[PDB]
Structure 1
Amino acid sequence: IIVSEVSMIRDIREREIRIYTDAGRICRPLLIVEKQKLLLKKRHIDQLKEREYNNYSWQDLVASGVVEYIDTLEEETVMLAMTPDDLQEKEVAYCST
């Protein structure tokens, strides 16, 4: 029901949910991470590595729910992480979220 470009911003401190759909909202794709583990599992990598032979492409990843476009106005409310393995294993409890 909602195209991938739409963005939902949750404002915690003041209860305001602002959703934007107009054009120009510069955005970029990121991987999703449910609890401490990515949704991009070996299955996806395998199917994708066999692309250009069958039909597999980025749209498959976007539909499967592994990647997601975040726009700058929504990027301010997401605990981003640099590399999957390094920043999640187990250490002093930084954010773990």
Structure 2
Amino acid sequence: HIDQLKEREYNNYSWQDLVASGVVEYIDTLEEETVMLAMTPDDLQEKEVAYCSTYTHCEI
């Protein structure tokens, strides 16, 4: 996805493609209360003391 997006502008690739592919998702204020949000993808998932290990989403 990153490679296909970095070559945007030139061809036609945009955010709608990411939304359709199933990588991003719109979570509203009411639904944000029932998801395990994560801050960074790498730091909060490697392997350490078992905090939740059940992250569902991750902030940009």
Identify the TM-score tier after normalising by the shorter chain.
0.7 to 0.9
Residue number in structure 1 paired with 2:30:
73
What is the aligned residue count?
A: 53
**Which TM-score applies when normalising by structure 2?**
0.88
* Identity across matched positions, percent: 100
Q: Are positions 1:95 and 2:60 aligned together?
A: no
CA distances 1:30-88 after superposition (whole Å, capped 9, x unpaired) = xxxxxxxxxxxxxx000000000000000000000000000000000000000000000
Residue number in structure 1 paired with 2:14:
57
The secondary structure found in structure 1 opposite 2:3 is: helix
1:1-97 residue pairs with structure 2 within 5 A?
44-96=1-53
CA RMSD of aligned residues (A): 0.2
4+ aligned runs moved over 6 Å, structure 1: none
List alignment gaps of at least 5 residues for structure 2: 54-60
Higher Cα radius of gyration: 1
More strand by share: 1
